[PDB]
Amino acid sequence: PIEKDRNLSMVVTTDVHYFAPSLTDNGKAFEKYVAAGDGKQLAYSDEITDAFLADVESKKTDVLIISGDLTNNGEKTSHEELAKKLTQVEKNGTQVFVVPGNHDINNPWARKFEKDKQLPTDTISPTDFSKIYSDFGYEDAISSDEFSLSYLAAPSSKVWLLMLDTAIYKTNMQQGNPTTEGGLTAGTLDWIKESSALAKKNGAKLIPVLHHNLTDHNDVKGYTINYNQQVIDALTEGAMDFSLSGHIHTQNIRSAKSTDGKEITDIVTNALSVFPHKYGNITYSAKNKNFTYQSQKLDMEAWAKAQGSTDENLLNFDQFDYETFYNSGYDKAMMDLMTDESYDKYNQADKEKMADTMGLNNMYFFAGTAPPKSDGMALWDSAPNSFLKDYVLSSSNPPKKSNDYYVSP
């Protein structure tokens, strides 16, 4: 614990969706899987994760936070390998804190790939999670919630972390699928209040971290936490000005109001596994007692070159990733345009313009920045009603407020 009332350097990431290389042979089965993984660089999760941690190390980061979805599909092996990397990070002096996401625990979808077959592989239980990641928040927690993997951590004397587990997994094996939506019981909400009171007694500011979102981040369920108003009210009552969440994967900042009018800013950092692969820098000013959040794009090309890599996709990662993610949204739209009988009145060239607009607006929405003008926009505006159309339109306008920078008030 950092007792000195000095500036604190922090980094937050989320949705690493780590997949242990030992769980795949990069065969047919794996290729199809990654193809349907809508944009996530699953094939390079090991390199992306290492590149990221190398950055944390060079920054000599005080605190590293990971807001859920540590693994692809809760594979025990992926969890163990990721834990090994975090153990090394801690040897450098950096304190690491993690919480689970919807894909991390009791995951019936845990699979390993061999040729044209997906085979079963072990997942983990809730207590397995607190055991595997005991060094990263759990063992030294100041307080731990009774029925969730939530806990209160004190990495320094002036700044504490309210690490929340908003994941729902206790009925996963019975469902056959990992629950996507998130939520907090009244008991965990009561614990949050007690925790907030303890931080206040100790003169510490508190940063609430959760996988699911505190409020909506797109005008177009299961991503914003269930019954979010109760959570917002609980956090604002604790005097917390901002929260760090993930799950939706898009670099996106939005504010919400408590029932009594207090504001809290929900900062969603880009999924580490998806374009543009940004992570968040958070700096605490001891003198001003405020927090400054600034996103940073992971430089894979620089890491690749320093590794002496011969993989062209990594040496040219910017282009590779740009194309990979653009095509994911392009194909997404084109499939619909080529299936719905309400679009056959559009000629091929137009469907292409529309697919292009989706690929552009979509990728820039994930980057959290303004999308460039595209000929497909006019076509979408007059196109038939649909969720897709709503999304394309809702992401056609420039962000009215930065999704990359925030300073607490």
Beta strand pairing call for 242-245 and 263-268: parallel
Q: Which does 102 bind (CB under 5 to 8 A by kind): Fe ion, Mn ion, Ca ion, none?
A: Fe ion
Q: Return d(Cα 270, Cα 251) in angstroms, integer.
A: 4
Q: 197 CB contacts (<8 Å, ≥6 apart)? A: none
104 near Fe ion (CB under 5 A): no
CB of 49 to Fe ion, least distance (A): 17
CB of 272 to Ca ion, least distance (A): 20
Rounded to whole angstroms, the maximal C-alpha distance in the chain is 68
Q: Return d(Cα 166, Cα 65) in angstroms, integer.
A: 15
Q: List phi, psi (to 5°) of 264.
A: -140, 135
Nearest to 2 by CA among 160, 200, 136, 197: 160
69 near Mn ion (CB under 5 A): yes
- Of 223 and 406, CB closest to Mn ion: 223
Out of 69, 145, 321, 404, the only residue in the binding site for Fe ion (CB under 5 A) is 69
Residues 49-78 that bind Ca ion (CB under 5 A): none
**Number of residue whose CB is nearest Fe ion:** 247
Q: Which does 215 bind (CB under 5 to 8 A by kind): Fe ion, Ca ion, Mn ion, none?
A: none
Compose the 200-239 pattern: x for residues touching Fe ion by CB under 5 A, - for all others: ----------------------------------------
Does the annotation list 102 as a binding residue? yes
101 near Fe ion (CB under 5 A): yes
- Contact between residue 355 and residue 361 where contact means Cβ atoms under 8 Å apart: no
Quickly count helices (H) and strands (E) in the chain. 13, 15
- Of 13 and 228, CB closest to Mn ion: 13
Compose the 324-363 pattern: x for residues touching Ca ion by CB under 5 A, - for all others: ----------------------------------------
Nearest to 359 by CA among 388, 383, 327, 391: 327
Q: Which does 135 bind (CB under 5 to 8 A by kind): Mn ion, Ca ion, Fe ion, none?
A: Ca ion
Peptide bond into 276 cis (omega under 30): yes
Bridge partners (DSSP) listed for residue 281: 11, 294
- Long-range own/partner contacts, residues 86-94 (CB < 8 A, 24 or more apart): 86/133, 86/135, 86/136, 87/135, 88/53, 89/53, 89/56, 89/57, 89/64, 90/135, 90/136, 92/57, 92/60, 93/60, 94/56, 94/57, 94/60, 94/61, 94/62, 94/63, 94/64
114 near Ca ion (CB under 5 A): no
CB of 238 to Mn ion, least distance (A): 26
The CB density around residue 56, as the number of other CB atoms within 10 Å, is: 20
Q: Which does 331 bind (CB under 5 to 8 A by kind): Mn ion, Ca ion, Fe ion, none?
A: none
Show the tokens assigned to 317. 């990662």
75 near Fe ion (CB under 5 A): no
- Contact between residue 282 and residue 51 where contact means Cβ atoms under 8 Å apart: no
Out of 31, 135, 181, 323, the only residue in the binding site for Ca ion (CB under 5 A) is 135
Residues 202-221 that bind Ca ion (CB under 5 A): none
- Of 101 and 376, CB closest to Fe ion: 101
Binding segment for Fe ion (CB under 5 A), chosen from 43-51, 229-237, 241-249, 261-269, is: 241-249
Which residues contribute to the annotated binding site for Ca(2+)? 90, 135
Which residues contribute to the annotated binding site for Mn(2+)? 15, 17, 69, 249
The residues binding Ca ion (CB under 5 A) are: 135
The residues binding Fe ion (CB under 5 A) are: 69, 101-102, 247
